[PDB]
C-alpha cells in the first residue's frame, strides 16, 4: 500500500531531478574544477579528541621531567608493560569509557613513531577482548557494538592514522562533492536563520511559498579596480546569510580556516558613485509590531537585482511561524547520484588506480583469523564484526562529520542532511532487516547498498594476504612520515599522570605476571616513578 504510493511520486519528480542534478554538477564542478584537506596534524586531532580545539598535543620544557621522560618511553615500548598496564587499569571500576577513550588516544599519540609496534599490541588487546566476550557466552553479533572498551578505542584510532592517505587518493572527492552538493542545494531556497529549517530539507524534520531569485555583483575585497564577482542569492536571506554567500563565492580557492569570518565583516550596498550604507542584520531600521525582533532581510531593505555590493571591515523570527512528500523525493532524487558515488568508493577494492589500503585488508584478514579460530562458520557473524569495525566506526564518523577531513564550516541545515545519509549508511551495513521518514525514503535502496557491503567484504577475502614482512614495511613507512608530527612529550607526560592514580594495582600486577617479573620490569617502573 505504501510502496505503490511512493513510486507514483518518484515518477512525477523524476524529470525534475535530471534538471536539478545537472544544474548542480555544472555549478559545483566549475566551483572546484578550475581541496581543503585538513593536514594530518589537524585531521588526526579532531578525531582522537572530540571538540578539543585546545592542547596539549602540538605544543613545555621541564628539567627534572625529561630525565624521567625517556624512562616512561622505553618502558612503555616493552610489549608486556603496555599490556599489563591496560589490563590492570581496565580491571578497575574507577575510570569509565570516557577515560578509556583518552588513554587509547594518548598512546596512539605516543607510539605514532612505532606504528609497527602498536599494531602488535592492538592485536593482542583485540584478541583477549574477543576471548573474554566469547568465554562469557556473549552473543557474537553483539560484541563490537557496543562496549567501546580500551582496545576498540585504539582500533578507531588505528584506522584514523592509516586511512588518511586513502581519503586523499580516492575517497576525498565524493565526500567533499557530497558536502558541496548539500551546501549548494539548501541555499537554492530559503533557510530560516532562527530555526535552521530549510526549503529543500532532506530530513523530514528540518523541512520548512513565494520567493524570488536575485543576483548581486560583489566587489572582490582581496583586490580592487578589477572585474567584479557576481553571487546568486535570494531576496529573503539574512544579512548574515548573504555575508556567508559572498564570502564563499569571493574566496572560492582560499580554505575556510583563513577566510575573514562573516561576523568581522559588514555588508555595504554600493550605489551611485561613492555612496554606500552599512546594512546590519539588526539595527535601528527594523520591522516589528509586537514584543518581538524581526531579522532584517533583503525585501525588508528593498534590494534590487544586479545590485553592487562590497564586504568591509565590521565597525526573534525569520520566515516560517508555527502530499507534502513530493518535495522530499525531489531532494532524495537530485542527490541520489552524489551518494551512490561515495557508497561505491567506500565499498571499492580497486578504485582509480589506487588499490585497497593495507590497513583494511590486513585487519579484515585478522578478524577472519579469530573467526576461523573459533569455528565460527556463520557468515552473518563475521559480517557484523567487520561492519562494527570499519564502516560503523570510522566511516559513519566522517560522513556525519566531514569537517574532520576538510577545512570547512558545516552550517545548521547541512548537518541535518548528512545525518539522514549517515543513518542510511548504517542500515546498509547492518545484516538485520527492517520494516519512519528515513526508512521509507531509501526503502528501495537499502537492499542494494547491502549487496555492495557483502561483495566488498568477499573481495577482500578472495585477495592474497599480506606478509608480516610487507606489513611491517608499510607500517614503518606511515610511522616515519608522521613521526614527530605531534609533541610526544605532552602525550607521554599525560599518560604518566594516570600511572600515579592507581600506582598500587599497577605494581602488584607488574610483579604478579611472571613475564614482567622475569625481565625485572617492575624495577624499571619504580625508577620511572620516583625520578619523575
Amino acid at each position: 500500500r505504501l510502496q505503490l504510493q511512493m513510486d507514483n511520486l518518484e515518477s512525477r519528480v523524476a524529470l525534475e531531478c535530471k534538471e536539478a542534478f545537472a544544474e548542480l554538477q555544472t555549478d559545483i564542478h566549475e566551483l572546484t574544477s578550475d581541496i581543503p584537506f585538513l593536514d594530518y596534524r589537524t585531521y588526526a586531532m579532531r578525531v582522537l579528541f572530540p571538540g578539543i580545539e585546545d592542547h596539549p598535543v602540538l605544543k613545555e620544557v621541564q628539567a627534572n621531567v625529561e630525565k624521567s621522560l625517556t624512562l616512561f618511553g622505553q618502558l612503555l615500548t616493552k610489549k608486556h608493560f603496555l599490556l599489563t598496564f591496560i589490563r590492570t587499569l581496565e580491571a578497575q571500576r574507577s575510570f569509565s569509557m570516557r577515560d578509556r577513550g583518552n588513554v587509547a588516544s594518548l598512546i596512539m599519540t605516543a607510539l605514532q613513531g612505532e606504528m609497527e609496534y602498536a599494531t602488535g599490541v592492538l592485536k593482542q588487546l583485540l584478541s583477549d577482548l574477543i576471548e573474554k566476550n566469547l568465554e562469557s557466552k556473549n552473543h557474537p553479533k553483539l560484541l563490537l557494538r557496543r562496549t567501546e572498551s580500551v582496545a576498540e578505542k585504539m582500533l578507531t584510532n588505528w584506522f584514523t592514522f592509516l586511512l588518511y592517505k586513502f581519503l586523499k587518493e580516492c575517497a576525498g572527492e565524493p565526500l567533499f562533492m557530497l558536502y558541496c552538493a548539500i551546501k549548494q542545494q539548501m541555499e537554492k531556497g530559503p533557510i530560516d536563520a532562527i530555526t535552521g529549517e530549510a526549503r529543500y530539507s532532506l530530513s523530514e524534520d528540518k523541512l520548512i511559498i513565494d520567493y524570488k531569485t536575485l543576483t548581486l555583483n560583489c566587489v572582490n575585497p582581496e583586490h580592487e579596480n578589477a572585474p567584479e564577482v557576481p553571487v546568486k542569492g535570494l531576496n529573503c536571506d539574512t544579512v548574515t546569510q548573504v555575508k556567508e554567500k559572498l564570502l564563499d563565492a569571493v574566496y572560492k580557492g582560499v580554505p575556510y580556516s583563513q577566510r575573514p569570518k562573516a561576523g568581522d565583516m559588514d555588508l555595504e550596498w554600493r550605489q551611485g558613485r561613492m555612496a554606500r550604507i552599512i546594512l546590519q542584520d539588526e539595527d535601528v531600521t527594523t520591522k516589528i509590531d509586537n514584543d518581538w525582533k524581526r531579522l532584517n532581510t533583503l525585501a525588508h531593505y528593498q534590494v534590487t537585482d544586479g545590485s553592487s555590493v562590497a564586504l568591509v571591515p565590521k565597525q526573534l523570527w525569520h520566515l516560517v511561524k508555527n502530499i507534502y512528500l513530493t518535495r522530499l523525493l525531489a531532494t532524495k532524487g537530485t542527490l541520489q547520484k552524489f551518494v551512490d558515488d561515495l557508497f561505491e568508493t567506500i565499498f571499492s577494492t580497486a578504485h582509480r588506480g589506487s588499490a585497497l589500503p593495507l590497513a583494511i585488508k590486513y585487519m579484515f584478514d585478522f578478524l577472519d583469523e579469530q573467526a576461523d579460530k573459533h569455528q565460527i562458520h556463520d557468515s552473518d557473524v563475521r559480517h557484523t564484526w567487520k561492519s562494527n569495525c570499519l564502516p560503523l566506526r570510522f566511516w559513519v564518523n566522517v560522513i556525519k562529520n566531514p569537517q574532520f577531513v576538510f577545512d570547512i564550516h558545516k552550517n545548521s541545515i547541512t548537518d541535518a542532511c548528512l545525518s539522514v545519509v549517515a543513518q542510511t549508511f548504517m542500515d546498509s551495513c547492518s545484516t538485520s532487516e527492517h520494516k519512519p521518514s528515513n526508512k521509507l525514503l531509501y526503502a528501495k535502496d537499502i537492499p542494494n547498498y547491502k549487496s555492495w557491503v557483502e561483495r566488498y567484504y568477499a573481495d577482500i577475502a578472495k585477495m592474497p594476504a599480506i606478509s608480516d614482512q610487507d606489513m611491517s614495511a608499510y607500517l614503518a613507512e606511515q610511522s616515519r612520515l608522521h613521526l614527530s608530527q605531534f609533541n610526544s612529550m605532552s602525550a607521554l607526560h599525560e599518560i604518566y599522570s594516570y600511572i600515579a592514580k592507581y600506582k598500587d594495582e599497577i605494581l602488584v600486577a607488574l610483579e604478579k605476571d611472571e613475564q614482567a617479573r622475569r625481565q625485572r620490569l617492575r624495577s624499571k617502573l619504580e625508577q620511572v616513578v620516583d625520578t619523575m
Partner: protein
C-alpha cells in the same frame, strides 16, 4: 571641516536635479527615481574650506530604508515643489515629523524648488483649471517658522536662480 547634509522630500520635486545642477553646475533631463546616492563638493564660505557631502534620498516605497542616511547629520533640507501644493502640505505632516525624530536638535533649511515654474504661464494653464495655485513666498515663509526651520530658501534647480544661495546658508547654519 566636513558638513553632512540630507535632502529629503516628495517624489519628483527636483531633489536630484538640485544636487546635480550644483555639484556639476549642470542640469540633466529625464527623471529616474532615486533610491539613495551621495555627492561631494568643497567650497569656501566667508573664508573657510568645507567638505560638503550632499545625501540624495528617495521620496513612500523607500520609507523603510531611507532612515539610514540621517545618522550624524548636521543639517537637513526638506523640499517641496513651488508648483505642487500637495507636497507643500506634506512638509508639516510627512517630513518634519520624521526628520526631527532621528536627528532632533539639528538645523533645518526648508527649500522651495522649481522657482522657474512660478513666473511661468504654461504651468498656470494646468493650475488655474485645477483650482490650485502655486505656493507664494508668504505661505512658505510662514511654514518655515512653523516647523522651526532656520531659514526659508527658494531656488530653481534648472536656471540656478539662487541655487548657490541655498547651500551657502545650509553651511552657515552649521
Amino acid at each position: 571641516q566636513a558638513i553632512k547634509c540630507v535632502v529629503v522630500g516628495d517624489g519628483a520635486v527636483g531633489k536630484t536635479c538640485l544636487l546635480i545642477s550644483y555639484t556639476t553646475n549642470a542640469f540633466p533631463g529625464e527623471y529616474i527615481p532615486t533610491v539613495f546616492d551621495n555627492y561631494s563638493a568643497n567650497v569656501m564660505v566667508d573664508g573657510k574650506p568645507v567638505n560638503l557631502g550632499l545625501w540624495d534620498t528617495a521620496g513612500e516605497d523607500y520609507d523603510r530604508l531611507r532612515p539610514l542616511s540621517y545618522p550624524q547629520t548636521d543639517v537637513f533640507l526638506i523640499c517641496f515643489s513651488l508648483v505642487s501644493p500637495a507636497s507643500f502640505e506634506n512638509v508639516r505632516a510627512k517630513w518634519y515629523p520624521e526628520v526631527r525624530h532621528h536627528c532632533p536638535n539639528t538645523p533645518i533649511i526648508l527649500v522651495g524648488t522649481k522657482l522657474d515654474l512660478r513666473d511661468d504661464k504654461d504651468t498656470i494653464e494646468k493650475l488655474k483649471e485645477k483650482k490650485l495655485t502655486p505656493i507664494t513666498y508668504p505661505q512658505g515663509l510662514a511654514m518655515a517658522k512653523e516647523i522651526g526651520a532656520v531659514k526659508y530658501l527658494e531656488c530653481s534647480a534648472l536656471t540656478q536662480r539662487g541655487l548657490k544661495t541655498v547651500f551657502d546658508e545650509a553651511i552657515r547654519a552649521v
